């Protein structure tokens, strides 16, 4: 029973490194954030910025979300991110991920009081 904000933190924050440094980053991180317990989660983005910087996006550029909701926000600046996406060789329980490191703007959906990120919509 995890709050939406806490789930976003676990799935999407990696403030301890500046960037992925190896092809095995996603395999490691998907496992240790408990994203491969029951199934291999197919796609998951990690953000290599402070939690404060990611939370601050909720006051930045208001944009539509993919699903048409209007509580999404696009970061004014690019951020260091890693996209983790399952390869064709991936088969639970032996999940396998491609690591793609990039510097891009993030789009998050925000909710609550405090008004914080609860969904990762996209990177641009
Ligand atoms: N893959 C994961 C890992 C944790 N969690 C949530 O985070 C909680 C653990 O802090 C989980 O509670 P359960 O252990 O009751 O499933 C679950 O609510 C999740 O929903 N999916
Ligand atoms: N670019 C993307 C697209 C999807 N996703 C993940 O895949 C899920 C469903 O598409 C998303 O749910 P949340 O936005 O609730 O975190 C997110 O965890 C991602 O992390 N990065
Ligand atoms: Cl930090
Ligand atoms: Cl912080
Ligand atoms: Cl804010
Ligand atoms: Cl505007
Ligand atoms: Cl922009
Ligand atoms: Na773990
Ligand atoms: Na931080």
Is 33 annotated to bind ligand? no
Active site residues: 12, 119
Q: In the CATH hierarchy, which top-level class contains the domain 1-124? A: alpha beta
Q: Look at residue 10 and give its three-state secondary structure.
A: helix
Is 43 annotated to bind ligand? yes
DSSP character for 70?
A: S
Residues 60, 18 contacting (CB under 8 angstroms): no
Method: X-ray
Backbone angles phi, psi at 16, to 5 degrees: -90, -10
Domain coordinates in residue numbering, the chain: 1-124
Q: Round to whole Å and give the CA distance between 88 and 78.
A: 29
Residue 93: asked if its preceding bond is cis (omega within 30°), the reply is: yes
Residues 36, 44 contacting (CB under 8 angstroms): no
Between the CA of 116 and the centroid of ligand 3 the distance, in Å, is 17
């Amino acid at each position: 029973k995890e709050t939406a904000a806490a789930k976003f933190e676990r799935q999407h924050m990696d403030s301890s490194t500046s960037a992925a440094s190896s092809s095995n980053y996603c395999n490691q991180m998907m496992k240790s954030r408990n994203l491969t317990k029951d199934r291999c989660k197919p796609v998951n983005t990690f953000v290599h910025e402070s939690l404060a910087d990611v939370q601050a996006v909720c006051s930045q550029k208001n944009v539509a979300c993919k699903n048409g909701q209007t509580n999404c926000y696009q970061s004014y600046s690019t951020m260091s991110i890693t996209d983790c996406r399952e390869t064709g060789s991936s088969k639970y329980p032996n999940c396998a991920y491609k690591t793609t490191q990039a510097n891009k703007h993030i789009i998050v959906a925000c909710e609550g009081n405090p008004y914080v990120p609860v969904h990762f919509d996209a990177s641009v």
